[PDB]
Amino acid sequence: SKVCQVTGKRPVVGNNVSHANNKTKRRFEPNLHHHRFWLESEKRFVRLRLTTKGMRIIDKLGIEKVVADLRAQGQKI
Amino acid sequence: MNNERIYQVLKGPVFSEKAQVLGDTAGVQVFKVDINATKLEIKKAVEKLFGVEVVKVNTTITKGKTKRFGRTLGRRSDVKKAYVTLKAGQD
Amino acid sequence: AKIKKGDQVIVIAGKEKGKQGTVLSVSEDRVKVEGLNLVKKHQKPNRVTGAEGGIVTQEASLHISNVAILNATTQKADRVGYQVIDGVKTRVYKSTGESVAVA
Amino acid sequence: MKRTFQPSELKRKRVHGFRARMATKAGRQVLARRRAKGRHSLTV
Amino acid sequence: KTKDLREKSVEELKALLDEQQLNQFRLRMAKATGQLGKSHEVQVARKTIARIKTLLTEKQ
RNA sequence: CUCCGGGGAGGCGGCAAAUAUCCUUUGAUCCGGAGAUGUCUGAAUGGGGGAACCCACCUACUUUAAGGUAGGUAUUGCAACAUGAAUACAUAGUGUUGCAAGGCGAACGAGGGGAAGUGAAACAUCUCAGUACCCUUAGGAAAAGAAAUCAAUUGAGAUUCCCUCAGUAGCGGCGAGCGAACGGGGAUCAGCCCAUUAAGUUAUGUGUGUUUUAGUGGAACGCUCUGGGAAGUGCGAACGUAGAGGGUGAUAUUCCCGUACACGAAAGGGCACACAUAAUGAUGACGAGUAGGGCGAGGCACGUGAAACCUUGUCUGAAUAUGGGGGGACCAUCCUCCAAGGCUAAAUACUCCUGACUGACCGAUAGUGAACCAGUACCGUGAGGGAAAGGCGAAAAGAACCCCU
RNA sequence: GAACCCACUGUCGUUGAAAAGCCAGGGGAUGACUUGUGGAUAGGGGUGAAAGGCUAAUCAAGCCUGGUGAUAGCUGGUUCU
RNA sequence: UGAGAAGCAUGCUGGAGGUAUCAGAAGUGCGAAUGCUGACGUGAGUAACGACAAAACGGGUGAAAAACCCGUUCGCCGAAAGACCAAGGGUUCCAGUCCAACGUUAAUCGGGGCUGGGUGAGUCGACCCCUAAGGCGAGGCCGAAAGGCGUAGUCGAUGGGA
Ligand SMILES: NCCC[C@H](N)CC(=O)NCCC[C@H](N)CC(=O)NCCC[C@H](N)CC(=O)N[C@@H]1[C@H](O)[C@@H](OC(N)=O)[C@@H](CO)O[C@H]1NC1=N[C@@H]2C(=O)NC[C@@H](O)[C@H]2N1
C-alpha cells in the first residue's frame, strides 16, 4: 500500500469544496516513489519506497542512520 | 489385529428364511457385523472364534429405516451383514 | 420426622382418619398402609399371559402428611424428633422423649 | 413447461455448501448469524 | 470386586482383561441366539472391563 | 469407571406405564470435591475435499503374511544452529530444533472509512449526523492524565464523571436550526521517572485472614358441627430471636418441607495482606526536518468570517534559556507556562453469565417468535422469513362383566 | 420430409387438465443447427443478431436484511352517560 | 329501582375464590378503519369428479363387490402407452395383517397404517492414476482495512488409463 517507509505517511481523506460550497469526499496522497540508495557498510543498493520529505530526512541524517532506525522498528531492508 | 478388535467384530447371527436356507443347503453363515469391519477382519474373527476354515466373505450394507413413532420421527442405524462360506462340511 | 417402611402409623386426615396399620412402602411424599385406602381396579384380561381380568381390591397411597406414627404406650398420634444417644442418631417421640419402638 | 428448479447435488453443494460459506468472510458471517439464531441446519 | 482386582499385578490384570473381553463376546453371542435368560451378566462384564482398564492406567 | 467426604431405606434417568433381570445396612440410589476415559467434523494444522469423507509418509516395538500399538509430519513470526548463488569476500536463499500466534463469543472501549430517507412547509449552503452501516483491535473496564493549562483583586493548580452557569455568549441561505466557556457546588483523590534507571504492574512460592463449592439439629393442638374430604364453624390450649414461603382432598404458627437460631469440611476454588525470587516499567539520558511559514483541507458551539488555537497532504523552515509558547486579527507592556521523551489507581461505561431478593408488570389472541420436543412445522435456489398448539380427577380409582354392531 | 428445435392461423379452454395449454393446419430440419454435463460474467452492474429484451412465475434499475415506526398540507377510523 | 351510564334481590348451572367505604394509578368502555385472529353461514346439496382406448359375464372372499382375486370373452398401445441407463427421489421393493384418515365414489384393494424381511463383485460403477474450462494459491506484485491478481504448485470430468 501507499505508505512511506521513512515517515509513515499515507493517504488521508478530505473534501473538494466548490464555489457554491458543495462538499465531496476526496483523498490527499503522498508524493511517494522508489529510490535506490548506496549502502556502503553493506556494499549494496537498497531500494526504498518513500516520499520527498523522506529524502530530505535522509539528506539531513545520513542513509546509515535512517536504515538503522528503520531496522530497529522491524522493517526488513 | 488385536484380540480386542477380534472380539468386537462379530455382533450376532441373522435369523431369516434366506439365512436359514443358505445355512441348510450351502454351508453359509450369515452374521451381523460391525459397520466398519472389513472382509479380512471378519475372516480372521470367524476363524479364531469358531475354529473353521473360511473360503470367502461377502458383505452388504442396508440403510436404516425412518419411521414416525408417535409424534416424533426416528431413524434406525445401518446394518452390515456378512455371508461367510465355510469349507467342505463345517458347522 | 421420618416415616419408614416398617412403622406403625395412624391416619390423621382423609376418609381413613382414625384407623391404623403397618406402612408398606414410602415413595416421594406418598405412603401405602396395609388394609387402608382400598380401591377397586377393573383389570382387563391379558391376551398374551391369560390371567383373565376381574375386579380386584388394592391399597392406594395417601399423602405422607396425612399419617403419624402411633405411640405404642399411649395409643395416640405423635411427632418424631431426633436425638444423638451414644454416637447414633435415633428417632424419638416428641410427647415423651422415648425412643421409637422398632416393629 | 420447464420450471426454475432443476436439481443437482454437486452444484448445490459447490454453491451453498459448508466449505463454500467458510471460504469467504461474508459466508462466515452468514454462518455466525444462523448459529446465533439457533438454526438446526446450518447449510444445504 | 474393585479391591480384588486392585491387589493383583499388571500382568494378571492384562490377562483378566482378555478373559473378560472373550466372556463378553460369548455372552453377546448367547443373548443374540436367545439362549440367555439371565441378562445382568453382560452389564457385570461390561463394568468389569472398565474397572480393569481404570486400574491398569492407575498402576501405569 | 476410581478415590475422598456427606447421607441412612431405598433404587435400576424422563416422555412412561408395565414387566423381567436385579442392586442395596458388608452403606445402594442420591449430593459435593478430586482424578481416569473422552470416536468423527469444525481455527482443523500430514495432502486433498461436496463438513462429519478419500489418500498418505517417517521412526520405534510387535505379528506372519497383505496387519497391530505408540509417537512425529500445517502455515507464519522470532531465536539458535547448520548449509549456501549470480560473485572473490559476503548477502539473498535453504533446512533442523525450540518458543508463540490464528478461531469463537453479549454489551461497554479505542481507532480506520462513512450515507440517505427526513427538516428547511420547494431546494443546492445547512440539517439529519460523525447517526445507521462496513473494517481493525484490547481490558475488566478502556481512553485521558500531572500545564509550553486557565485566570485577570494577580489568583487557581493533573485526568475523569454529575448539578449549575444557560438555551445565556455566540454560530447561522442571520433561514430551518446548532449551541459554549469562565466561575461555583459535588464524586474520587496520587504522583513517579529518562541509561549505577522510580512509583507501579504481572508471574511464581510460602504464611495469615476471609469467602465459596455437600450437610446436621431445629418449638408448640385438642374436642365439636357442616362436609366426599377441614386447614372452615363453636369452645378452650401451647410456641414464638420461628406469624417468610410452599404443600397437604376447601382457607394451617402448632400435619409435612421449611423459617429464626445454633453447628459443620477429606478435598478444591476466589479474594485481601506480608515476605521471597523472576521479569516488566526502560532502545529511553531535557527531546530539529521540530516550532513557525506559503498553498489545499479537517476540528474547534464558531459555515472565512475582524478568526486566534489544534491536525497535516504539498512546498519550506528557526531560536535553542541574554531562549521559547499562550493570553481569539495585530503591536507594546504585563501575567503565566517550558512543546518537539515516558509510566500511573479511584471516582466513569456495560451485562453473554452466577446467587439471593423484589414488582399498584402479563396470565395462553396477553407475556419472549417460542409455557407444549420452536427458530421446530412450513415457505424459498439462497441470504432469509416464520407459525398454531396449556387445564379429567384429591387419588387412574382411566370403566371387570352383559347387550346392539 | 420423420425424430429434434420452433411458434404463423383458427376453434376450444379463461373459478382451465395447464399462473400460457390441447387439437387441426404451419416454419427450419448439415447448420449463423439442436442438445447433456461442468464452468465465467452481479444490480446504475452483467448480458443483449437491439424488443428496454433477459438477469429463479419478480425488471425504466433483481431479491433479502437493516436506516425504519422514512415522510404524506391526502383518504379512512377514533369505543360509556 | 333510578334521569342515564347502571344498581339490588333471587331460581337454575358452576365448584374456589370475591371484596364494602374512602383514597391512589390506568393496557378503562368498539359497529364501522376494502381493520387483525379463530369459528360459522349464503350461493347449494348447485358446478365438478382431470384426455370420448371400452367394456361384459361366471365363480371366490367379504358386513357390504361396477372398481380386489381366479376364469371366459371384447377393446387400446406397440419408434411407445414396451425394455433399459444417467440425473433426481429415498424404502415407494417383498410378505403377512388392518380400513378410521389419505385415494376426487365404495373398497375386502393400494405407492395408505402396523409388523417382519430384502440390496452378496479382483472383472459393473464409484474410489484410484491423468489432465480441460475454471477455482484456490507458499513466496510475490498491488490496495485506507476488508481485499484484488498471480508464480511454483494443488484441485477440478462432461474426456484418457487392467
Ligand atoms: N356404560 C357404557 C360402558 C361401555 C363399555 N365400557 C364399552 C365401551 O364402550 N368403553 C369405551 C372406552 C372409552 C375410551 N375409548 C377409552 C380410552 O380412550 N383409553 C385411552 C387409553 C390410552 C390413552 N390415550 C393414554 C394417554 O393419552 N395418556 C396420557 C398422555 O400420555 C398424556 O396426556 C397428554 N397431555 O397428551 C399425559 C399427560 O401428562 O397423561 C397420560 N395419562 C395419564 N394418566 C395418569 C394419571 O391419572 N396420573 C399419573 C400419570 O400416569 C397420568 N397420565
PDB file of C-alpha atoms in Angstrom, chain B:
ATOM      1  CA  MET B   1      -5.074 -57.344  14.552  1.00  0.00           C
ATOM      2  CA  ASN B   2      -5.609 -57.396  18.299  1.00  0.00           C
ATOM      3  CA  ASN B   3      -7.914 -59.599  20.353  1.00  0.00           C
ATOM      4  CA  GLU B   4      -9.965 -56.532  21.315  1.00  0.00           C
ATOM      5  CA  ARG B   5     -10.977 -55.898  17.709  1.00  0.00           C
ATOM      6  CA  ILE B   6     -11.276 -59.657  17.179  1.00  0.00           C
ATOM      7  CA  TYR B   7     -13.909 -59.906  19.922  1.00  0.00           C
ATOM      8  CA  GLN B   8     -15.618 -56.710  18.743  1.00  0.00           C
ATOM      9  CA  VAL B   9     -16.020 -57.597  15.043  1.00  0.00           C
ATOM     10  CA  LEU B  10     -18.954 -60.047  15.213  1.00  0.00           C
ATOM     11  CA  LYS B  11     -22.282 -58.896  16.665  1.00  0.00           C
ATOM     12  CA  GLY B  12     -24.702 -61.784  16.145  1.00  0.00           C
ATOM     13  CA  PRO B  13     -26.402 -64.234  13.793  1.00  0.00           C
ATOM     14  CA  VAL B  14     -29.160 -63.474  11.298  1.00  0.00           C
ATOM     15  CA  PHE B  15     -32.469 -65.336  11.638  1.00  0.00           C
ATOM     16  CA  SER B  16     -34.471 -65.254   8.409  1.00  0.00           C
ATOM     17  CA  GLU B  17     -35.722 -67.612   5.729  1.00  0.00           C
ATOM     18  CA  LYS B  18     -32.883 -66.706   3.354  1.00  0.00           C
ATOM     19  CA  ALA B  19     -30.225 -67.155   6.043  1.00  0.00           C
ATOM     20  CA  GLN B  20     -31.754 -70.462   7.141  1.00  0.00           C
ATOM     21  CA  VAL B  21     -31.848 -71.803   3.577  1.00  0.00           C
ATOM     22  CA  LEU B  22     -28.243 -70.749   2.951  1.00  0.00           C
ATOM     23  CA  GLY B  23     -27.115 -72.410   6.175  1.00  0.00           C
ATOM     24  CA  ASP B  24     -29.081 -75.573   5.441  1.00  0.00           C
ATOM     25  CA  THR B  25     -28.025 -76.128   1.828  1.00  0.00           C
ATOM     26  CA  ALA B  26     -24.870 -74.145   1.015  1.00  0.00           C
ATOM     27  CA  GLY B  27     -22.741 -74.132   4.175  1.00  0.00           C
ATOM     28  CA  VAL B  28     -23.029 -70.365   4.592  1.00  0.00           C
ATOM     29  CA  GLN B  29     -23.346 -68.495   7.889  1.00  0.00           C
ATOM     30  CA  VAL B  30     -24.912 -65.029   7.969  1.00  0.00           C
ATOM     31  CA  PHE B  31     -23.718 -62.594  10.633  1.00  0.00           C
ATOM     32  CA  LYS B  32     -24.399 -59.075  11.753  1.00  0.00           C
ATOM     33  CA  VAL B  33     -21.000 -57.394  11.908  1.00  0.00           C
ATOM     34  CA  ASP B  34     -19.610 -54.041  12.961  1.00  0.00           C
ATOM     35  CA  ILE B  35     -20.284 -51.322  10.398  1.00  0.00           C
ATOM     36  CA  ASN B  36     -16.546 -50.702   9.943  1.00  0.00           C
ATOM     37  CA  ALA B  37     -15.471 -54.361   9.780  1.00  0.00           C
ATOM     38  CA  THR B  38     -13.527 -55.465   6.706  1.00  0.00           C
ATOM     39  CA  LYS B  39     -13.668 -58.814   4.935  1.00  0.00           C
ATOM     40  CA  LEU B  40     -10.223 -59.843   6.194  1.00  0.00           C
ATOM     41  CA  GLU B  41     -11.224 -58.828   9.723  1.00  0.00           C
ATOM     42  CA  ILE B  42     -14.401 -60.926   9.530  1.00  0.00           C
ATOM     43  CA  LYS B  43     -12.479 -63.902   8.141  1.00  0.00           C
ATOM     44  CA  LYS B  44      -9.906 -63.769  10.936  1.00  0.00           C
ATOM     45  CA  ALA B  45     -12.572 -63.307  13.615  1.00  0.00           C
ATOM     46  CA  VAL B  46     -14.638 -66.269  12.421  1.00  0.00           C
ATOM     47  CA  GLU B  47     -11.569 -68.485  12.042  1.00  0.00           C
ATOM     48  CA  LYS B  48     -10.317 -67.680  15.545  1.00  0.00           C
ATOM     49  CA  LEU B  49     -13.632 -67.772  17.414  1.00  0.00           C
ATOM     50  CA  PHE B  50     -15.154 -70.840  15.733  1.00  0.00           C
ATOM     51  CA  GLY B  51     -12.204 -72.947  14.556  1.00  0.00           C
ATOM     52  CA  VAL B  52     -13.436 -73.379  10.981  1.00  0.00           C
ATOM     53  CA  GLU B  53     -11.986 -72.646   7.547  1.00  0.00           C
ATOM     54  CA  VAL B  54     -13.446 -69.723   5.590  1.00  0.00           C
ATOM     55  CA  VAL B  55     -13.480 -69.814   1.791  1.00  0.00           C
ATOM     56  CA  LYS B  56     -14.743 -66.281   1.097  1.00  0.00           C
ATOM     57  CA  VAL B  57     -16.700 -63.440   2.693  1.00  0.00           C
ATOM     58  CA  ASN B  58     -19.459 -61.351   1.100  1.00  0.00           C
ATOM     59  CA  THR B  59     -20.681 -58.162   2.777  1.00  0.00           C
ATOM     60  CA  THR B  60     -23.665 -55.861   2.277  1.00  0.00           C
ATOM     61  CA  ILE B  61     -24.932 -52.701   3.993  1.00  0.00           C
ATOM     62  CA  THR B  62     -28.637 -51.959   4.491  1.00  0.00           C
ATOM     63  CA  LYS B  63     -29.553 -48.379   5.359  1.00  0.00           C
ATOM     64  CA  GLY B  64     -31.757 -47.813   8.383  1.00  0.00           C
ATOM     65  CA  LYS B  65     -35.456 -47.042   8.098  1.00  0.00           C
ATOM     66  CA  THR B  66     -37.091 -43.765   9.130  1.00  0.00           C
ATOM     67  CA  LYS B  67     -40.445 -44.206  10.855  1.00  0.00           C
ATOM     68  CA  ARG B  68     -42.911 -41.912  12.600  1.00  0.00           C
ATOM     69  CA  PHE B  69     -43.225 -43.377  16.103  1.00  0.00           C
ATOM     70  CA  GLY B  70     -45.930 -41.420  17.889  1.00  0.00           C
ATOM     71  CA  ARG B  71     -45.424 -37.706  17.270  1.00  0.00           C
ATOM     72  CA  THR B  72     -41.674 -37.899  16.558  1.00  0.00           C
ATOM     73  CA  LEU B  73     -39.657 -39.106  13.569  1.00  0.00           C
ATOM     74  CA  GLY B  74     -36.948 -41.647  14.339  1.00  0.00           C
ATOM     75  CA  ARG B  75     -34.260 -43.421  12.350  1.00  0.00           C
ATOM     76  CA  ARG B  76     -32.683 -46.826  12.822  1.00  0.00           C
ATOM     77  CA  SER B  77     -28.985 -47.485  12.326  1.00  0.00           C
ATOM     78  CA  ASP B  78     -27.428 -49.035   9.236  1.00  0.00           C
ATOM     79  CA  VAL B  79     -26.741 -52.774   9.454  1.00  0.00           C
ATOM     80  CA  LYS B  80     -23.883 -54.603   7.737  1.00  0.00           C
ATOM     81  CA  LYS B  81     -24.359 -58.313   7.038  1.00  0.00           C
ATOM     82  CA  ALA B  82     -21.638 -60.846   6.247  1.00  0.00           C
ATOM     83  CA  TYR B  83     -22.147 -64.032   4.228  1.00  0.00           C
ATOM     84  CA  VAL B  84     -19.378 -66.444   5.258  1.00  0.00           C
ATOM     85  CA  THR B  85     -18.882 -69.539   3.107  1.00  0.00           C
ATOM     86  CA  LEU B  86     -17.338 -72.437   5.011  1.00  0.00           C
ATOM     87  CA  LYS B  87     -15.080 -75.104   3.537  1.00  0.00           C
ATOM     88  CA  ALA B  88     -16.490 -78.572   2.721  1.00  0.00           C
ATOM     89  CA  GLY B  89     -18.532 -79.770   5.721  1.00  0.00           C
ATOM     90  CA  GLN B  90     -18.131 -77.382   8.649  1.00  0.00           C
ATOM     91  CA  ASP B  91     -20.579 -76.047  11.245  1.00  0.00           C
TER      92      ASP B  91
END
